[PDB]
């Protein structure tokens, strides 16, 4: 097990291209199994038979470099354990909350998460640190071939892979990128980009996906069109949009430095001073300050602090990890004290060494 | 070369609340020069002539409380005699011919008056009633617990004045207030009793805040510490509030590795005269906010 102890696995702690702004790359493949009804129509037995179908096939069959697969059943996990998986981005909020027969199939390296009995019978999702959409598609395609050797996909040649929700009919592909855009939010150029992004077929979402708000200036950029295009082209289209979004973030940072100057240096250090010394902090402010301190490390204002630890605090300060860190359920008053105590401790360590 | 002399940095009785005590005794053109020339022959003390000081040097002595603003600006022919420990400061040609001033740290009015009259006999003994007794108090709990606007009419009724040291008009910046005032010995004893009454009320108000706010009070004091120790721009008012918070946090024991002198010491060094002196050249207001923050970071960095 021990998927619950670390916030960012060794796989995901690797430095990737454009890791200063692009946190990770995700590629989702949606599939349904023949002779079972869809997740939107199907009885409790078809749910547990699908989980039984996957459990039989993949428990005693490792994945090489990825490692052996462990089957996690939502019914057998505790509410913190579910929230810790959502907060580590392993499973969706839909699976942890609204899917009692849901399951998850995790590789040891935690780069592969296969969601069972969610919106689709199968949600194959690969995760790569930094911007690596092309690499994530080969691994997803390679895994997709590997899985359909042991199960039979419900596919119509004209229709394509059958899906419960109209939004992902056809190839069943959602490719997304998670990006930190503090400068585009501060310059308010994010109110222009978002609607422009929607016009090209891309969708802008929160840190935990649809229904999520943007925590700490971290947004999810994913394609919405799922028809009339190959997987390779839609991944190529998302990449170029992300390349433009990277350039706009990096240029807006120079505009902020040239315009604000010492005031921007004052903004990031004040946020540092709060996080390093506060005794009570809420989820909203902690995200804003951690975003500011991350901005300060990228620009060179803040020294002796790694940006990885800040990537790790965004997760460790979420309700799931905090309770686990505390060891037991926490009340809303208690979480603001624990959250601030956690952040001081991790920063105290950085200064010493 | 120092904002608060080694004499002033010493602990005094009730120095957690009372920053210092002072006593100003009033005693009595060409004759004015004769008076200055008569003192310099008499006097170890050092003499400073206003006509030989430049405007920045004038503003630094007023920020230190060593010389009055009236003498620095409306008396180019004035003079001042300073002690080595800066305890004693004698002003010449202010409102009266001599205005003798004593400064002890904390609440030591009796000791300050004793010395004040003692060298007055020394002056009367070699050459041939306007008493102004004051204390400075840091009262953040009586301000935050909303008692301060009730107490100052009660204090005025007994014949004592209350004036914010650093705040323009009624507003007091940094929660630092000046309390000032029959026989001389009754006047100082009359003030002394009310001051202890204010100390008892301040300390009780601090316990009320701790018992009431708890972790929230600790968060407020440390957030103010985090700002001062790390900010790059800060104005006169935010610095005054945060220094007041940090001092309170040190008094209550939350902040354990910073000496309480920072309040006494930075509220004087953050004044325009010392700020310009800090930078070494005239500063425009936006440059002051940059220099104000840099000075406070160095001071906190010196303890921590
Ligand atoms: N780039 C990315 N990195 C990490 N996680 C990502 C991601 N893009 C999407 N996700 C995760 O994918 C999960 C589902 O996101 P959602 O927007 O519903 O896409 P979906 N259901 O079509 O697969 C979310 O819980 C979100 O945390």
Curated annotation (Swiss-Prot), chain B:
Signal peptide positions on this chain: none
Recorded catalytic activity of this chain's protein: L-arginyl-[protein] + ATP = N(omega)-phospho-L-arginyl-[protein] + ADP + H(+)
Keywords: Allosteric enzyme, ATP-binding, Kinase, Nucleotide-binding, Transferase
Molecular function per GO: ATP binding; creatine kinase activity; protein kinase activity
Annotated GO CC locations: extracellular space
Broadest EC class assigned to this enzyme: transferase
Regulation: Appears to be allosterically activated by the binding of pArg-containing polypeptides to the pArg-binding pocket localized in the C-terminal domain of McsB.
Reported impact of residue 232 to E: Abolishes dimerization. Large decrease in protein kinase activity
Binding annotation for ATP: 20-24, 65, 99, 132-136, 163-168
Effect of residue 65 to A: Loss of protein kinase activity
Note on domains (UniProt): In the 3D-structure the McsB dimer adopts a flat 'domino tile' shape, with the two active sites opening on the same side. Individual subunits are composed of the N-terminal catalytic, ATP:guanido phosphotransferase domain (PD, residues 1-263) and the C-terminal dimerization domain (DD, residues 264-355), which are linearly organized in a PD-DD-DD*-PD* manner (asterisk denotes the partner protomer). The PhK-like catalytic phosphotransferase domain is structurally adapted to target protein substrates.
Record-given protein name: Protein-arginine kinase
Organism expressing this protein natively: Geobacillus stearothermophilus
Name of the coding gene: mcsB
């Amino acid at each position: 097990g021990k998927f619950f102890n670390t916030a960012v696995s060794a796989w995901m702690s690797q430095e990737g291209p454009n890791s200063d702004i692009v946190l990770s790359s995700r590629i989702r493949l949606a599939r349904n199994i023949v002779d079972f009804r869809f997740p939107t129509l199907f009885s409790s037995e078809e749910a547990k038979q699908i989980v039984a179908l996957f459990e039989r096939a993949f428990v005693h069959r490792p994945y090489g470099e990825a490692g052996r697969f462990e089957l996690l059943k939502m019914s057998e996990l505790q509410p913190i354990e579910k929230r810790v998986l959502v907060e580590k981005h392993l499973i969706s909020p839909h699976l942890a909350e609204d899917s009692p027969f849901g399951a998850c199939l995790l590789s040891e390296n935690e780069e592969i998460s296969i969601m069972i009995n969610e919106e689709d019978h199968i949600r194959i999702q690969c995760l790569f640190p930094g911007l690596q959409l092309a690499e994530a598609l080969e691994a997803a395609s390679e895994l997709d071939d590997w899985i359909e050797g042991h199960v039979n996909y419900a596919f119509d040649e004209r229709l394509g892979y059958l899906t419960s929700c109209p939004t992902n009919v056809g190839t069943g592909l959602r490719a997304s990128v998670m990006m930190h855009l503090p400068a585009l939010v501060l310059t308010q150029q994010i109110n222009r980009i978002i609607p422009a992004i929607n016009q090209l077929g891309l969708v802008v979402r929160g840190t935990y996906g649809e229904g999520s708000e943007a925590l700490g200036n971290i947004f999810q950029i994913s394609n919405q069109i799922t028809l009339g295009k190959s997987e390779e082209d839609i991944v190529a289209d998302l990449h170029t949009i992300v390349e433009q979004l990277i350039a706009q973030e990096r240029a807006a940072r120079q505009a902020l430095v040239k315009t604000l100057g010492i005031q921007l240096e004052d903004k990031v250090f004040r946020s540092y001073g709060i996080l390093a010394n506060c005794r009570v902090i809420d989820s909203k402010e902690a995200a804003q300050c951690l975003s500011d301190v991350r901005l300060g490390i990228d620009l060179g204002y803040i020294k002796n602090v790694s940006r990885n630890i800040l990537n790790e605090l965004m997760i460790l300060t979420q309700p799931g990890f905090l309770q686990q860190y505390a060891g037991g359920v926490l009340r809303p008053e208690e979480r603001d004290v624990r959250r601030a105590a956690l952040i001081r401790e991790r920063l105290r360590m950085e200064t010493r060494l």
